[PDB]
């Protein structure tokens, strides 16, 4: 009866039933093969470790993400993570409840085809559907009008949606996301005397960026304050026991979202892609899209990103237009919230692709249906 919604993101896998507020299953999407020979005999040494067991034993593992910027690079570990979150995390079978998968727009069709094939052949689900992460994150907002700024761990994409009709010709996609920010933070933290080279360590930098990084109102004056005094510096407690003192890196690595020239990308920052997509949209819907900029994803959780997004957009947009940046306090899981509120809808229950519909169509039904 109930439906499963599985937000297979690049950094986290939010999986839970339909009709509830919060996702019950949340864990990093990495698999870890044992790095060392393992002299001790017995104790249940396994070939792989998924999620929290990998996070706890990350010292002796070699963590890696199966999903790049949205595309699934490796498939065996992806279906392994799916089997894990289905059996060892939710303790349910896929043959009973329909599953709901999410993806980013401007996605290779091979990824969706392999998703459908894996879901229908290995697990044999009665029905499923492949929605868009940004559209669901807009559902969670309760409204139907406004452009969505969805930026997760691997991809940042924006799609403007009017009063039910979205604009596919203005869908912008930026490969700059949280993983790139973590890489830039690792690259700029070596200038302080802290080398993070290995994948296992990189997670420490990820947590440091999650709980110590913020976006400045403006770059110049915050640098001037960084240059003068240590009033800005703050210390962190490392798992090994040492302490580090980061200064301008607290707001320099989040600035890459607005100035991609730091990691080398030529793409316009997240504050300019939205304005360019709205300027590519229709001239009557711009008044409604300017005052509705729905943000989602874990990357939009920095303290002060909403204020800078606002300021930048009213700097780009005309003065008479008013800019509003909807910053929900549960925007980290807004995609899952939208999927769960979508799965309970009665009108949507008819457009699930079913096995009986899938047999004659093959793995190509997903493009024509979704």
């Amino acid at each position: 009866t109930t439906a499963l919604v599985c937000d297979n993101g690049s950094g986290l896998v939010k999986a839970g039933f339909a009709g509830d507020d919060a996702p019950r299953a949340v864990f990093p999407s990495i698999v870890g093969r044992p790095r060392h020979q393992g002299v001790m005999v017995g104790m249940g040494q396994k070939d792989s470790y998924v999620g929290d067991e990998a996070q706890s034993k990350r010292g002796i593992l070699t963590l890696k993400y199966p999903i790049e910027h949205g595309i699934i690079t490796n498939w065996d570990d992806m279906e392994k993570i799916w089997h894990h979150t289905f059996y060892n995390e939710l303790r349910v079978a896929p043959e009973e409840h329909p599953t709901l998968l999410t993806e980013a727009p401007l996605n290779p069709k091979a990824n969706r085809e392999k998703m459908t094939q894996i879901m229908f052949e290995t697990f044999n689900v009665p029905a499923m559907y492949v929605a868009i992460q940004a559209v669901l994150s807009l559902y969670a907002s309760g409204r139907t009008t406004g452009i969505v700024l969805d930026s997760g761990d691997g991809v940042t994409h924006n799609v403007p949606i009017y009063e039910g009709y979205a604009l596919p010709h203005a869908i912008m996609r930026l490969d700059l996301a949280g993983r790139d920010l973590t890489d830039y933070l690792m690259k700029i933290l070596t200038e302080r005397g802290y080398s993070f080279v290995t994948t296992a360590e990189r997670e420490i930098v990820r947590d440091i960026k999650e709980k110590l990084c913020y976006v400045a109102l403006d770059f110049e004056n915050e640098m001037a304050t960084a240059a003068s005094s240590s009033s800005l510096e703050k210390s962190y407690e490392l798992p090994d026991g040492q302490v580090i003192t980061i200064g301008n890196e607290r707001f320099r690595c989040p600035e890459t979202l607005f100035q991609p020239s730091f990691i080398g990308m030529e793409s316009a920052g997240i504050h300019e892609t939205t304005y360019n997509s709205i300027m590519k949209c229709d001239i009557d819907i711009r008044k409604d899209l300017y005052a509705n900029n729905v943000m989602s994803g874990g990357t939009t959780m920095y303290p002060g990103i909403a204020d800078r997004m606002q300021k930048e957009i009213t700097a780009l947009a005309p003065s008479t237009m008013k800019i509003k940046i909807i910053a929900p306090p549960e925007r980290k899981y807004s995609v899952w919230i939208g999927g769960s509120i979508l799965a309970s809808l009665s009108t949507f229950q008819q457009m699930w692709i079913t096995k009986q519909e899938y047999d004659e169509a093959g793995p190509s039904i997903v493009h024509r249906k979704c």
Partner: protein, 164 residues
């Protein structure tokens, strides 16, 4: 190494790790925390039916699932464990299982070496487990903070429905 696992322990682990849609009357006899032992011949890993904890009783007869679990471990012998934790993080609310390797110093060497060399024979068969907790002293496992330190470190604000 040597000692291998039996079918009952594997069945119990598959029953506890993967839960399914169950009736409200049957859901109260699920296994919450079960220990593992050795037989007379010390050749198979068997769970003892005597010492155990049900999911139904938690929150009723057992006011504290962890508090009533420390005293359940014998201090004169080595034991395995499998604790299903429900801790609250600042970030979110998680529900994971913990593998506790109980090995006091007061136990004889014959029970310590067998359980230490055959740990890879049991841990490898328990697929999908992440949180590993090796405890030798009794005071370190009796403390409540160590579970939150191993599970999520300083991020775990509440453990088992109550704050730290």
């Amino acid at each position: 190494s040597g000692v291998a696992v039996s079918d009952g322990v594997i069945k119990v682990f598959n029953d506890m790790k993967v839960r399914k849609s169950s009736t409200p009357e049957e859901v109260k006899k699920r296994k919450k925390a079960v220990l593992f032992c050795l037989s007379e011949d010390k050749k198979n890993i068997i769970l003892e039916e005597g010492k155990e904890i049900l999911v139904g009783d938690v929150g009723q007869t057992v006011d504290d699932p962890y508090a009533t679990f420390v005293k359940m471990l014998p201090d004169k012998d080595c034991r395995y464990a499998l604790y299903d934790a429900t801790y609250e993080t600042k970030e979110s609310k998680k529900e994971d299982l913990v593998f506790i390797f109980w090995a006091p110093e007061s136990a004889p060497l014959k029970s310590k070496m067998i359980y230490a060399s055959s740990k890879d024979a049991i841990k490898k068969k328990l697929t999908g487990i992440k949180h590993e907790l090796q405890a030798n002293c009794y005071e370190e496992v009796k403390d409540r903070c160590t579970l939150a330190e191993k599970l999520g470190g300083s991020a775990v604000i509440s453990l088992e429905g109550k704050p730290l």
